[PDB]
Design a binder for this molecule. Structure first.
Ligand SMILES: [Ca+2]
Ligand SMILES: [Ca+2]
Ligand SMILES: [Ca+2]
Ligand SMILES: [Mg+2]
Lengths: 735, 146
């Protein structure tokens, strides 16, 4: 954002040693106000007229109230402000004299003035009483009714009080003032002419120079960020789609701050939000049953699957039931089914939600049943009175998709053990990710170990010793029998989350059961909205997989917090065979990196297992072996590229010795690529491996002497029989 | 129990360096198959593995004898990834590259005090191609290479 652009360095100093003199005059802050309003100042040679590469027809001259007073003969100007979006001050000079009759350089101030002004205290925030009153100094305050400088035509209206009644009207007139006011306070000659003829505006400008220019230069710098940002609907406006329960979120708001670590959750279904506050325990890993979003059960894991979202999916439900059964079968005493008892508040909730309709009553065997209604067309529901249990049955003119038909039975739901008591289950807090600050991980490391590592001689082993430490105590994730796959701190932080939501008033046990979806390598899922609770307290809820990505990049990744992303990203995860995209840097730099021995051999084995033919077949064709031999040769050059002994050399050399080792590779590639009928699949690959090398050598070139384009440097080589001088050649070729 | 893909490689590489195309590789040959594969045993640890199953020309290993020995140090080590996540960590700006700037930067948040001299000193020795910056590749090298 260089604010001042000097077009022509034509003349010697004079032009320069003049533009400077002009700028060193104006306050370093008034400028920053400019370089904030996105302004730029232009000092061109003699482009006087509409010649400025930025002076043609955009938003030019519409209504004539130009200079101090007025004149408007454009063609005769040397100073101008491109009035409309970003401010653009364009100015030029010819010969020496400006001081004599500064009546000239004074316009570089007003001519400027029309820049900050209207966006300055005079009107940005509004004509705040500060300038709303300085305006009043027409003739009411001090015995100084001397303003025959800026109020000749537009304000010879002494007979009309100047407060709010009419100041809006001609905001521009009170501009023609902040202008000549500025021009007079900073002009190189008349400074006191604005300390005499105007008793207060001097003080205004002065107060402004005092620090008033640093003012807006901060109420703008701040709205500099807060403006162009990443839409995220923070505050309880988010905590509303979060699903999370306010006492909990707010509860979490303490942990983020104490341990300085972002917390991100996927979305907790709304039809569970309260069941959670209500005290219903949450679904762990043991249960793989489907929740539901309708009827009386909604928010519970209906032991019966044809009563959960997947209503009708004869096989999803089929396999669905089969899932709760094992959930219990295998993990028993902890996982089972208990009757659905919709407490008080709950009913009124599924009511104003439309999930259920409470109406007519009825009698049966002696007990009362308010009959609960729901537009489901196969099952009917009624809720007991004694105990508020619930029941359903197949309507007398329908059946269960699986092929079942039954009379009034209670609705059991899945429930896990909780202090020896099968409590019902609802959605849990599935963390999407945990971003502890790097500093918080150092605290995770045991002083002795770290010490034993930094108190080393090898400047490089040190780094290694450290990274492993940072890997060991912070990035590593081992699997757990209980909590899925997760880091160790991930766990400590995991308990502290629950404890926090239990030292509040939760009696359903734990609300965060497993680790972070960033380890759900098998069945990873893509959620648009992600609730995040910053290290300080603000709640946030991104809107796009990207925004989330974009957020995390700005606030987490490149900001001193340790984050890692789902390994199955950019790949094709097995479990659900879903491809989930995430910006990976290392990949952003592959396009320019010579591959590796093994990175190469890998991509072969790849193609082999597909089109079942290798770069070389197990035959006697001495032409085939020609090929075999030849790849073994590429898998050498490449292997030679990445030689760690390259250190006993020096940057310049490295770049060279490498551009060659590199080239060597690119060559035998050109070779095979023109060899015998290597499957068209490998044809391409190699064609890809070329661009790489290429890109890689250009890079290593633009770091030193770069006019030579890879394509050209190539020609000049002789890869015929001898290899010797070739390099000696290459050398000179790059000097 | 190496995945099949963990086989295609361990062979598409075991063969490439099988000059006398039989189906077994000499000593130096194993040594080579491994290095290429991005690994590298010691001048003497190269034996203990092969040196243990002599039923060949007392110094040669078949495809099996190999695809097998690949769990003495493989069925264990799952480090490759940690190391690539450590990388994305230092690369504080998303340029796929690590710079002395960001090295030193992150080197301190973790509580270490490095001298402007001794950081431009790491980067250097970590750099193999001279571009004055460490990429995953060279990073992976620095770390693993013992
Ligand atoms: Ca052999
Ligand atoms: Ca970087
Ligand atoms: Ca490098
Ligand atoms: Mg869960």
């Amino acid at each position: 954002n260089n604010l001042v652009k000097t077009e022509f360095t034509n003349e010697t100093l004079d032009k320069i040693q003049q533009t400077q003199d002009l700028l060193k005059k104006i306050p370093k802050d008034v400028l920053e106000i400019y370089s904030e309003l996105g302004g730029e100042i232009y000092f061109t040679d003699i482009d006087l007229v509409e010649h400025k590469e930025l002076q043609d027809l955009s938003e030019e001259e519409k209504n004539s109230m130009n200079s101090r007073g007025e004149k408007v003969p454009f063609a005769s100007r040397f100073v101008f402000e491109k009035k409309r979006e970003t401010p653009k001050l364009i100015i030029n000079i010819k010969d020496y004299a400006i001081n004599s009759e500064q009546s000239k350089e004074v316009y570089y101030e007003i001519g400027k003035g029309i820049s900050l002004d209207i966006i300055s205290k005079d009107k940005s925030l509004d004509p705040e009483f500060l300038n709303l009153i300085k305006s009043l100094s027409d003739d009411s305050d001090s015995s100084d009714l001397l303003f025959s400088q800026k109020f000749k035509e537009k304000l010879e209206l002494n007979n009309k009080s100047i407060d709010i009644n009419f100041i809006k009207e001609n905001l521009t007139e009170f501009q023609h003032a902040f202008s000549l006011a500025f021009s007079y306070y900073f002009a190189p000659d008349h400074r006191t002419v604005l300390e005499l003829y105007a008793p207060d505006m001097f003080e205004y400008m002065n107060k402004l120079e005092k620090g008033g220019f640093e003012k807006i230069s901060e109420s703008l710098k701040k709205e500099g960020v807060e403006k162009d940002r990443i839409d995220v609907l923070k505050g309880e406006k988010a905590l509303k789609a979060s699903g999370l329960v306010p006492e909990h979120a707010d509860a979490f708001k303490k942990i983020a701050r104490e341990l300085n670590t972002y917390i991100l959750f996927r979305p907790v279904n709304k039809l569970a939000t309260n069941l959670i506050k209500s005290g219903v325990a949450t679904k762990g890993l043991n249960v793989h049953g489907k929740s539901s979003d309708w009827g009386p059960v909604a928010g519970y894991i209906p032991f019966d699957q044809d009563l959960s979202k997947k209503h009708g999916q004869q096989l999803a439900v089929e396999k669905g039931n089969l899932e709760n059964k094992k959930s219990i079968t295998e993990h028993e005493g902890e996982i089972g089914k208990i009757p659905l008892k919709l407490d008080h508040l709950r009913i009124e909730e599924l009511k104003e939600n439309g999930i259920i309709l409470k109406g007519k009553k009825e009698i049966d065997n002696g007990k009362k049943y308010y009959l609960l209604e729901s537009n489901n067309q196969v099952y009917e529901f009624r809720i007991s009175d004694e105990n508020n249990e619930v029941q359903y049955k197949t309507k007398e003119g329908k059946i269960t998709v699986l092929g079942e038909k039954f009379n009034w039975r209670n609705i059991e739901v899945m429930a896990k053990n909780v202090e020896g008591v099968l409590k019902p289950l609802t959605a849990d807090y599935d963390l999407f990710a945990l971003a502890p600050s790097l500093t918080e991980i150092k605290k995770q490391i045991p002083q002795k170990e770290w010490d034993k590592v930094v108190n080393t001689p090898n400047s490089l082993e040190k780094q290694k010793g450290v990274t492993n430490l940072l890997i060991k105590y912070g990035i590593e994730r081992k699997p757990d029998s209980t909590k899925g796959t997760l880091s160790n701190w991930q766990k400590q932080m995991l308990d502290r989350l629950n404890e926090a939501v239990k030292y509040t008033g939760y009696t359903g046990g734990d609300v965060v059961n497993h680790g972070t979806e960033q380890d759900n390598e098998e069945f990873p899922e893509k959620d648009n909205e992600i609730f995040i609770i910053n290290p300080e307290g603000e709640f946030i809820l991104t809107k796009n997989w990207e925004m989330t990505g974009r957020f995390i990049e700005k606030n987490i990744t490149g900001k001193d917090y340790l984050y890692y992303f789902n390994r199955s990203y950019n790949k094709i995860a097995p479990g659900n065979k879903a491809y989930i995209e995430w910006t990976d840097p290392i990949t952003k730099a592959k396009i320019n990196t010579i591959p590796t021995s093994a990175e190469f051999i890998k991509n072969l084995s790849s193609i082999r297992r597909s089109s079942n033919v290798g770069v070389y077949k197990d035959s006697g064709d001495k032409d085939e072996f020609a090929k075999k031999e030849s790849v073994k040769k590429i898998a050498g050059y490449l292997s030679d590229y990445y030689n760690s002994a390259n250190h006993i050399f020096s940057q310049e050399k490295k770049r060279k010795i490498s551009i060659f080792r590199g080239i060597q590779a690119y060559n035998e590639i050109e070779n095979v690529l023109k060899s015998k009928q290597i499957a068209p699949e490998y044809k391409n690959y190699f064609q890809y491996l070329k661009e790489r090398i290429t890109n890689q050598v250009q890079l290593l070139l633009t770091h030193q002497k770069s006019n030579i384009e890879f394509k050209l440097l190539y020609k000049q080589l002789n890869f015929t029989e001898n290899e010797t001088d070739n390099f000696e050649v290459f050398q000179k070729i790059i000097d | 129990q190496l995945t099949e893909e963990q086989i295609a490689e361990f062979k598409e590489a075991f063969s490439l360096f099988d000059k006398d195309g039989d189906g077994t590789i000499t000593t130096k040959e194993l040594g080579t198959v491994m290095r290429s594969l991005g690994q590298n045993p010691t001048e003497a640890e190269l034996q203990d593995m092969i040196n243990e199953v002599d039923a060949d020309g007392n110094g040669t290993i078949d495809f099996p004898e190999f695809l097998t020995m690949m769990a003495r140090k493989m069925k264990d080590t799952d480090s490759e990834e940690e190391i690539r996540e450590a990388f994305r960590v230092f690369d504080k700006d998303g340029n796929g590259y690590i710079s002395a700037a960001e090295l030193r930067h992150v080197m301190t948040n973790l509580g270490e005090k490095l001298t402007d001299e001794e950081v431009d000193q790491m980067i250097r020795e970590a750099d193999i191609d001279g571009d004055g910056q460490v990429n995953y590749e060279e990073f992976v090298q620095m770390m693993t290479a013992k």
